[PDB]
Structure formats: structure tokens, C-alpha cells
Amino acid sequence: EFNILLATDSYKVTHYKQYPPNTSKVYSYFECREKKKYEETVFYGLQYILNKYLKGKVVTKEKIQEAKDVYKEHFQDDVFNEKGWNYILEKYDGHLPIEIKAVPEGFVIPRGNVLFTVENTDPECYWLTNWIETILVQSWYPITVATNSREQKKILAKYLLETSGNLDGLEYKLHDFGYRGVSSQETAGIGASAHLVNFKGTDTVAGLALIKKYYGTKDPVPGYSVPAAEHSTITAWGKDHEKDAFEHIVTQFSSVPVSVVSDSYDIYNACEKIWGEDLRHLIVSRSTQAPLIIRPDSGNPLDTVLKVLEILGKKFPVTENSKGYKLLPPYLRVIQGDGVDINTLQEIVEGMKQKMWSIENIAFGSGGGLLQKLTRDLLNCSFKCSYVVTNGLGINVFKDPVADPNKRSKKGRLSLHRTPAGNFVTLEEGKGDLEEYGQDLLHTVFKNGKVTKSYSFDEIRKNAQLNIELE
Amino acid sequence: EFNILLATDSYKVTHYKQYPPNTSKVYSYFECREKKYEETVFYGLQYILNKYLKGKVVTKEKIQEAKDVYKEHFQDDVFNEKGWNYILEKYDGHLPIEIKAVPEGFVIPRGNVLFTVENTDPECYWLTNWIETILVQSWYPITVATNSREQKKILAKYLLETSGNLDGLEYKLHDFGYRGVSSQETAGIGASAHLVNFKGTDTVAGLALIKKYYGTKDPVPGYSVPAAEHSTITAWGKDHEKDAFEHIVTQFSSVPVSVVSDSYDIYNACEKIWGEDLRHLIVSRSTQAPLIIRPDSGNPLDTVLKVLEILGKKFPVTENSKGYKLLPPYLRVIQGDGVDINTLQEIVEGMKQKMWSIENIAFGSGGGLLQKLTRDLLNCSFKCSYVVTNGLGINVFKDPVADPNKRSKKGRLSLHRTPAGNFVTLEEGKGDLEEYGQDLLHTVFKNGKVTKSYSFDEIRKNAQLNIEL
Ligand SMILES: O=C(Nc1cccnc1)c1ccc2c(c1)ncn2CC1CCN(C(=O)c2ccccc2)CC1
Numbered sequence: 010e011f012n013i014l015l016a017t018d019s020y021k022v023t024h025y026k027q028y029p030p031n032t033s034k035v036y037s038y039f040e041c042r043e044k045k046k047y048e049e050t051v052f053y054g055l056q057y058i059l060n061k062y063l064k065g066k067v068v069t070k071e072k073i074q075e076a077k078d079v080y081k082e083h084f085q086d087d088v089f090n091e092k093g094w095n096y097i098l099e100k101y102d103g104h105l106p107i108e109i110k111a112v113p114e115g116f117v118i119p120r121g122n123v124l125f126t127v128e129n130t131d132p133e134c135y136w137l138t139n140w141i142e143t144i145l146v147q148s149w150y151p152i153t154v155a156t157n158s159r160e161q162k163k164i165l166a167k168y169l170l171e172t173s174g175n176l177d178g179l180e181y182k183l184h185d186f187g188y189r190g191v192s193s194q195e196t197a198g199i200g201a202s203a204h205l206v207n208f209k210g211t212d213t214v215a216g217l218a219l220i221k222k223y224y225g226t227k228d229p230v231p232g233y234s235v236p237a238a239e240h241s242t243i244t245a246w247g248k249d250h251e252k253d254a255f256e257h258i259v260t261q262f263s264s265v266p267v268s269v270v271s272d273s274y275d276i277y278n279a280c281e282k283i284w285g286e287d288l289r290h291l292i293v294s295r296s297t298q299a300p301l302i303i304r305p306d307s308g309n310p311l312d313t314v315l316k317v318l319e320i321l322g323k324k325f326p327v328t329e330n331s332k333g334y335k336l337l338p339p340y341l342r343v344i345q346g347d348g349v350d351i352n353t354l355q356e357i358v359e360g361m362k363q364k365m366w367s368i369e370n371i372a373f374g375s376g377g378g379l380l381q382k383l384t385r386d387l388l389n390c391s392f393k394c395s396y397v398v399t400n401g402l403g404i405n406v407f408k409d410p411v412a413d414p415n416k417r418s419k420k421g422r423l424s425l426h427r428t429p430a431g432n433f434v435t436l437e438e439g440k441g442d443l444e445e446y447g448q449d450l451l452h453t454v455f456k457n458g459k460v461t462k463s464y465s466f467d468e469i470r471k472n473a474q475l476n477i478e479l480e
Numbered sequence: 481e482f483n484i485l486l487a488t489d490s491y492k493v494t495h496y497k498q499y500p501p502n503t504s505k506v507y508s509y510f511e512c513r514e515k516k517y518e519e520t521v522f523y524g525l526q527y528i529l530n531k532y533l534k535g536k537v538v539t540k541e542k543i544q545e546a547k548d549v550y551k552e553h554f555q556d557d558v559f560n561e562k563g564w565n566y567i568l569e570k571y572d573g574h575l576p577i578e579i580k581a582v583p584e585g586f587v588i589p590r591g592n593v594l595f596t597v598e599n600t601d602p603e604c605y606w607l608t609n610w611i612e613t614i615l616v617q618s619w620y621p622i623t624v625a626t627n628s629r630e631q632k633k634i635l636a637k638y639l640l641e642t643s644g645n646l647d648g649l650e651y652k653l654h655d656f657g658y659r660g661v662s663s664q665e666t667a668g669i670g671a672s673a674h675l676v677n678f679k680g681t682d683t684v685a686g687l688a689l690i691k692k693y694y695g696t697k698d699p700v701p702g703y704s705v706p707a708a709e710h711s712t713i714t715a716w717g718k719d720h721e722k723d724a725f726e727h728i729v730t731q732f733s734s735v736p737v738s739v740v741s742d743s744y745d746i747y748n749a750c751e752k753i754w755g756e757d758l759r760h761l762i763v764s765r766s767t768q769a770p771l772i773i774r775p776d777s778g779n780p781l782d783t784v785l786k787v788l789e790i791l792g793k794k795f796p797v798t799e800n801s802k803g804y805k806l807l808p809p810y811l812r813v814i815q816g817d818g819v820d821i822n823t824l825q826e827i828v829e830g831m832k833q834k835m836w837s838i839e840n841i842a843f844g845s846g847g848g849l850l851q852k853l854t855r856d857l858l859n860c861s862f863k864c865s866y867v868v869t870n871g872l873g874i875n876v877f878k879d880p881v882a883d884p885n886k887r888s889k890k891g892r893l894s895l896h897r898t899p900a901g902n903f904v905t906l907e908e909g910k911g912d913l914e915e916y917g918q919d920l921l922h923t924v925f926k927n928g929k930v931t932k933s934y935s936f937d938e939i940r941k942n943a944q945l946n947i948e949l
């Protein structure tokens with residue numbers, strides 16, 4: 010069973026001996042620190058953490074003894090704050106005396122703004138605020154996946170609008186292929202849910218259960234997929250029988266969309282000769298609601314996409330849409346699911362545009378690029394103490410390393426406001442109390458062991474919409 | 481509760497319909513495909529077998545749950561309810577699968593078979609690749625353990641050169657990655673993989689994982705020491721940094737203590753606060769209880785070099801038997817910012833050029849150690865190499881025209897020692913010809929049971945560096 014006393018960085022076990030004596034309050038905040046591009050971030054994922062790990066009776070006598078036993082050996086010394094943990098157990102029935110205030114989930118906020126704050130609600134528990142830094146800072150991950158996924162959606166939207174005149178199908182243009190490519194089952198669920206803030210296509214099944222349990226949607230599920238082959242279901246037929254494999258698969262799934270990986274031996278032969286001649290009759294007969302989606306999976310991503318389109322354009326009837334771009338017939342589409350990240354996505358759609366191919370023709374699958382190849386440094390997600398009360402006096406505190414001004418932190422009690430022009434500003438030093446800037450956008454989401462405000466996944470999606478979608 | 485029917489890539493739900501009719505066997509394998517990182521540490525499969533694959537993993541409730549989810553997810557009924565029910569009824573929900581693997585901790589060159597998977601019941605031909613997704617996640621502990629060991633090689637080389645021995649090597653790269661990974665589960669897995677090579681960690685989640693799935697003779701596999709963070713310094717207020725330092729080193733006067741010293745001005749902290757104002761509290765400390773000064777910002781190499789030159793002028797420096805400078809034993813440094821395998825190399829080489837012993841330094845690494853890694857680094861990959869259809873075995877493979885690096889292996893595979901004592905993977909069932917001795921893979925999972933396992937102590941022995949051996 011999960012034990013919050015064993016879910017912090019080891020050194021934090023020793024911090025209760027290090028704060029100034031007579032400290033009754035430690036107040037800390039999380040931001041995606043600005044860096045002298047990702048100019049705005051989607052705030053998402055805290056509600057998962059609050060419910061799974063922080064709420065309710067999280068301290069027991071057994072949990073205290075187990076931590077005591079572990080740390081004795083881990084430090085070769087008795088340093089553990091048993092008294093402090095016992096106090097929470099006795100006084101609060103093991104509920105954390107902490108208050109967390111946060112911007113609403115799904116909100117899109119520029120870098121360098123307070124996103125949430127944490128403080129103890131009982132002076133005895135001044136040490137508790139930063140004990141839970143480690144677990145709260147892990148919100149970096151769903152924030153960063155959601156943000157990076159949204160930035161890819163912006164690129165897709167721009168090019169889809171340019172080449173087609175609308176945004177139809179945008180929410181299915183970037184499919185999560187990342188289940189095998191992330192570091193754990195838990196990560197798979199968290200990351201997949203973050204991508205679904207922006208899109209509806211996923212093969213990372215773990216995301217669905219997380220959303221259902223912690224957030225909730227009006228619809229039965231937040232994400233969808235379609236029948237699709239992998240190399241094993243093609244290659245198992247034997248190298249001389251690729252055509253038989255293709256025929257079998259498209260016939261099995263004749264009335265729904267079907268994606269067929271086509272590069273097992275020779276992607277170009279498969280497109281030109283197998284799909285484009287031998288099996289052409291089984292493709293041109295398909296419904297618009299049930300296209301064949303051809304899937305290359307190797308080679309230079311841009312070069313391969315363009316060559317695949319060129320081949321298909323010569324074997325199938327291509328039209329020219331009202332924007333002047335080439336469009337494959339509605340029973341035939343392409344998905345590029347190899348080597349896709351935010352950079353290569355941009356390269357591919359720009360290359361397509363230059364060759365006069367509509368973005369309507371293509372979708373993308375992304376795995377490692379979408380869910381794994383991200384770190385806390387990308388958006389400088391960071392948690393810092395900004396205010397303490399010692400001997401009954403409040404003190405505004407901060408770091409400001411001489412050799413790196415980018416790592417300077419904010420001072421004092423913080424609040425987030427709308428500016429007169431409708432942008433965001435973080436007020437420092439308790440200046441929000443002056444009330445010159447309207448209401449603090451941070452809301453209490455956790456207090457003394459209870460989750461006090463929750464968001465549905467539908468609300469989060471609404472909050473995270475693109476401007477272009479809003480227009 | 482975990483449901484293995486919901487723990488695969490969506491598209492695999494539809495694969496039972498795609499294989500050739502009358503297929504009775506699907507046999508697949510995992511390798512770190514050949515293209516830096518010439519050899520890999522095999523680690524972490526045991527965790528996966530025990531936590532997710534063994535015992536009764538199918539129930540009526542789990543089948544119904546999956547059925548209901550997939551119906552909405554595909555907007556169609558494509559889920560193999562009958563196949564899963566068969567496993568439930570015939571095997572009491574135990575997976576009819578056999579997995580063979582190289583021993584955990586083994587160090588194996590790229591492009592060798594590391595584990596194989598096949599169904600043991602013809603009805604469950606589809607099951608082999610259903611569990612690809614789960615098993616492929618072994619890329620992560622493999623890659624962490626491998627990259628950690630590569631850093632250990634660098635540290636060993638330079639420590640040996642500058643000091644004449646490897647004392648303390650196992651404490652020279654400390655895991656700071658708990659906050660910088662993507663989840664609690666990932667933290668435990670990644671921390672455990674780092675502990676294959678080192679003994680220093682702050683990612684507490686690693687300890688319980690090792691204890692539960694692997695085991696050590698020692699009470700714990702990893703250790704830490706009291707250390708400050710910026711909040712415990714800055715909380716004292718900007719004019720009271722000295723007071724914070726004094727309080728902390730006095731509280732931890734007889735154990736090692738690490739104190740982050742860059743809150744405002746690392747160079748002032750080292751030269752004036754530690755080097756002058758509080759010097760008397762440092763030079764009095766035991767060799768078993770040094771002050772470890774922690775810079776945490778600036779160019780990592782330039783900052784380490786300047787911190788060392790500052791301390792070298794305020795404290796008595798000796799010259800060790802190799803001709804390198806050594807701080808007194810009550811004083812050390814740890815660089816815990818911007819450390820990955822690349823910058824680690826740069827820092828130790830820069831220290832060597834300035835005649836500073838690697839004895840003086842330790843490193844902390846977080847995202848660089850546990851997060852900034854992907855399945856592409858070692859090309860960790862699972863592929864089908866052999867099927868039986870209509871009673872006939874076929875050797876199968878992919879070989880994409882535009883990328884020969886993605887060509888997969890053919891047929892039944894086995895791992896062997898060559899006449900020169902190296903590893904070789906034989907394809908096409910050629911291991912059966914008995915020209916290369918016995919298969920070095922062992923059966924580790926069969927029909928719902930873990931059949932062979934390794935303690936964490938044995939994994940560590942297998943993973944030792946040559947220079948350690
Ligand atoms: O192979 C697949 N997934 C997978 C998972 C893990 C590892 N590798 C691959 C896979 C999964 C879902 C797929 C897929 C292929 N091909 C299409 N989809 C889902 C959607 C089907 C509906 N879509 C289209 O019709 C469409 C496709 C291209 C352009 C415009 C529209 C857009 C994508």
C-alpha cells in the first residue's frame with residue numbers, strides 16, 4: 010500500500026531540523042518559470058494527485074512505524090520526525106493539515122505565473138508544506154504532455170485551415186501510440202489522459218480509466234480508436250504473402266476505418282502495386298465512413314509521406330479542393346506514426362503544403378515523442394518557498410543565484426489575476442490584498458484532507474480550447 | 481485494480497482477427513537492436529512478471545469491464561470475449577505463455593535476444609503479442625540501468641586515474657530524480673535500476689520495490705544523508721544565510737551533511753561564509769562527518785572548478801600519491817545541477833586538467849538520470865520471429881526497404897557463448913544444431929508461474945564493471 014511518509018525525497022525527512030526555530034508557517038508555490046518556445050501552459054493533473062495520494066486518512070500507526078524502520082537503515086541514523094507525524098494522526102485522524110489553492114484545470118496560462126500554492130493550516134505542521142513538494146511537483150508531467158500536445162494541435166490547426174478552409178477532423182489528427190514507449194503503467198495513464206485534453210484519438214487504453222475515475226466525462230469514453238494492423242499480423246503470413254495479409258485484413262474490417270501498416274518489406278511497392286493495382290478494387294469500393302488508412306512506419310518521415318502521397322495520387326483519383334490543394338478520394342487516407350514529435354510534425358505539414366497536398370489527407374501517430382521525450386526542464390516546472398512566518402512575523406523569502414537570474418523565485422504571498430487587457434499577472438508580496446486587480450483566480454482545491462473543488466474532464470477540455478477553435 | 485485486458489495498445493484488441501487462419505503459435509522476442517551504448521544491462525522483467533503477469537490475472541468481472549470499455553472505445557464489438565473466457569475457464573485465469581530470458585543484471589552487447597515469448601496453448605496464439613505492450617516497458621529499467629552503468633564507467637576511469645583506487649565509487653552518482661519523473665511508479669522502477677550500479681539515492685520509492693520484488697541481504701539497498709534545500713536556507717531571510725548554515729551544521733554535527741550554498745551567491749558562501757565566518761565549525765568535523773558543499777546553478781564545470789579553487793585557498797589542501805589536489809577529509813563537494821552522462825564526462829575531465837582529484841566530488845542527477853531517456857536510445861524492440869500455421873512453422877521478419885536498421889531476426893532464437901567467450905544470437909532454430917553449446921536463456925515464466933528469479937545482490941554482481949572485477 011502507498012505510504013505518503015515514504016513518498017518524498019530522502020533529504021526532506023531531515024528538514025524539520027533545519028527551518029528557523031519558531032516557524033509557524035511555510036508557504037510555497039508552483040510555476041512554469043520563464044526562461045530568458047512554449048509561452049503558455051495547460052494546467053492539468055493536480056486533481057489526480059490530490060485524490061489518489063493526498064486526501065483522507067493518509068497517516069496510520071503502521072505507516073509511521075514502517076517509515077521509522079526504513080529511514081533508520083537508509084540514513085544509518087534516527088533523524089525521522091515521528092512526533093510530527095504522530096500529531097497529524099492524533100489531532101486530525103491522519104488527514105493532512107494543508108491548504109492548496111490552484112488555477113482551474115484546463116486553464117492556459119503564460120509562463121512565469123503562480124499555478125498553485127501550498128501552506129500548512131496548523132503551526133505544528135510548518136514542515137509538511139515542503140514534505141509534499143516531491144509528489145506535487147510530479148504534476149509537471151501531465152502539464153507538459155498537455156501543453157506539448159496542445160502546441161502540436163496549434164500547428165495542425167494552422168495547416169489544416171490553410172490547406173482545407175476548415176478544421177474538420179482536427180481532434181483526430183494526432184493519435185497517442187505511446188503506451189509501450191513510456192516508463193510505467195501509471196505514467197501511461199497519466200500521460201494518455203493529458204493528451205486527451207486536446208485530442209480524441211488514443212491507443213493508450215490506461216488513459217480512459219484514469220479520466221473516468223478522477224475527472225469524468227458526459228460521454229461514455231474520452232478517447233477512441235480503430236482496427237489497425239501491426240507488423241506481426243502482416244509478417245505472420247510469410248514474406249511472399251503480404252498481399253494475402255492485406256486482403257484478409259481489409260475484408261475482415263470492411264465497414265469500419267482500418268489502418269494497415271504497409272512498410273514491412275517495401276512501402277513503395279505496397280502502395281503502388283499491392284494497394285494501387287492488385288487490391289485496388291477492394292479500396293475504391295469502401296465507404297467514406299470506412300476508409301483504408303495506409304501506414305508507413307520507416308524512412309525519413311517527410312520524404313516518405315511525400316513519396317507515398319505521390320504514388321497514391323497516381324493510382325487513385327485525386328481532386329483539387331477549393332483552396333487549390335490535392336485531396337485523395339474519401340476512402341483512402343494516410344497515417345504517419347514513426348518519428349513524430351513537435352518538430353517533425355511541423356516539418357511534415359510544411360512539406361506537404363509546399364507540395365500542394367491538403368492536410369486533410371494525413372493524420373499522425375506519436376508515441377515516445379508525445380509521452381516520454383519530455384522533462385521537467387522543458388517548462389521549468391518548479392516549486393519554491395516564498396513566505397514564512399517566524400516569531401509571529403511574516404517574511405518574504407526567495408532564492409536569487411548570482412550566476413543564473415533565470416532561477417530567481419517569487420517573493421511573499423502570491424495571487425493570480427486578470428489584467429485590464431485580459432491577460433494574466435501574478436502579484437507578489439501579498440499585493441493581491443490591495444484588491445486593485447479583481448478576484449484571485451486561484452481557488453482552494455484541497456484543505457485539511459478534503460478535495461474542496463473538482464473539475465470534470467469536459468470542463469478541462471473547454472478551458473484548454475485553442476483560440477482558432479474559439480473563433 | 482489492474483486489469484491486463486485493459487493494459488495493451490487498443491489496436492491489439494483487433495489482432496486475433498488478422499493473423500492467418502489456423503495459426504497455433506506466435507513466437508516473439510525482445511532485443512536492444514543494433515545501430516555509444518554498445519552493451520546493455522538486462523534488468524526489470526522480474527518486476528513486470530510478478531506485479532502484472534503471474535497468477536490469476538483474468539476474472540469474469542475483468543472480462544466484462546473490458547468488453548464494456550472496448551465497445552465504446554471502438555464504437556463496435558471487436559473484443560475477443562471468447563478467447564479471454566477460454567483462459568479463465570481452462571487455466572483459472574493463468575496465462576498460457578512461456579517466457580525465456582537472460583539473467584537479470586547480465587551485460588550483453590546490442591542486437592542479441594534478451595527474452596522470448598510464446599503461447600503454450602494453440603487457442604491462445606493471439607496472447608503472445610497482446611502482452612507486447614506491457615513487456616516492452618522493460619525498456620525503461622534496462623535503459624536507466626545501462627545509462628547509469630555507463631556513467632559509473634566514466635567515474636571509475638577518472639577516480640582510478642586521479643586517486644589510484646575506486647574507494648567511494650558506489651556513492652559518486654546520487655539519484656535526485658524523484659520529483660523529475662513522470663509518476664510514482666516510474667520513480668520506484670527507475671530508482672531501483674540506478675541502484676543496480678550505485679548505493680546513493682533520495683528516491684525512496686526504489687527501496688520498497690527492491691525489497692518486494694528482488695531482495696537484498698542488507699536491510700536496504702540504498703542510502704542518503706541529511707541535506708538542505710533552498711527553502712531551509714532562504715526561510716531564514718536573505719541577511720541570515722550564515723545563521724542558516726550554522727544551525728544546520730550544528731544540528732547534524734556528527735553525520736555527513738550536505739548544504740546547498742548558491743541561494744544568493746555561491747562564491748561568497750564558499751569564500752566568506754564557509755571559508756571565514758564558519759570555518760571553525762568545519763575544520764573541527766570528523767572524516768566520517770564531512771560538510772558537503774552543494775552548488776546548484778551556473779555552468780556546471782566552471783562552477784565546480786571555481787568552488788574548488790575557492791575552497792583550496794581557504795582550507796588546507798594536500799597532494800595525493802598521484803599528484804592531484806585533495807581537500808581535507810571533513811570537506812567535499814557535490815554538483816547536483818545539470819548532470820547527465822555528457823556533462824559528467826566534461827566535469828571530471830575538466831577537474832583532471834586542473835589537477836583536482838575526483839575524490840573531492842560527487843554528483844547528483846535527476847531528470848538526466850531517470851527521465852531524459854526513451855525507448856529509442858537502445859532501440860528496445862519486440863517482434864514476431866516465428867509462427868506455426870496449418871501445422872507448419874514459418875520464419876517471419878520485417879525488413880523495411882528504407883531502413884535496414886529495422887530488419888528483425890528470423891525464426892526460433894537462442895543465445896550462446898562463442899569460442900572466444902562472447903555472446904551470439906542464433907536464428908532459424910540453428911541453436912538446435914548443437915554447434916554452439918547450450919542456450920543461455922532460462923525459462924522465467926510459464927503458465928502463470930514465475931519459474932526463475934534473481935536477488936538484487938546477484939543482479940548487482942552480474943552488473944559489475946570489468947575494472948571492479
Ligand atoms: O497502428 C495504430 N496504432 C498503434 C499503437 C501503438 C503502436 N503502434 C501503432 C493505429 C491506431 C489508430 C489509428 C491508426 C493506427 N490509423 C488511424 N487510427 C485512428 C484514426 C482513424 C480515423 N482517422 C482517419 O480516418 C484519418 C486518417 C488520416 C487522415 C485523415 C483522417 C484518423 C485516425
Ligand SMILES: O=C(Nc1cccnc1)c1ccc2c(c1)ncn2CC1CCN(C(=O)c2ccccc2)CC1
Binds near residue numbers: 813839
Ligand atoms: O541535496 C540532496 N539531494 C536532493 C534530492 C532531490 C532533489 N534535490 C536534492 C543530497 C542528497 C544526497 C547527498 C547530498 C545531497 N550530498 C551528499 N549526499 C550523499 C553522499 C554523502 C556521502 N558522500 C560523501 O561524503 C562524498 C561527497 C563528495 C565526494 C566524496 C565523498 C557522497 C554523497
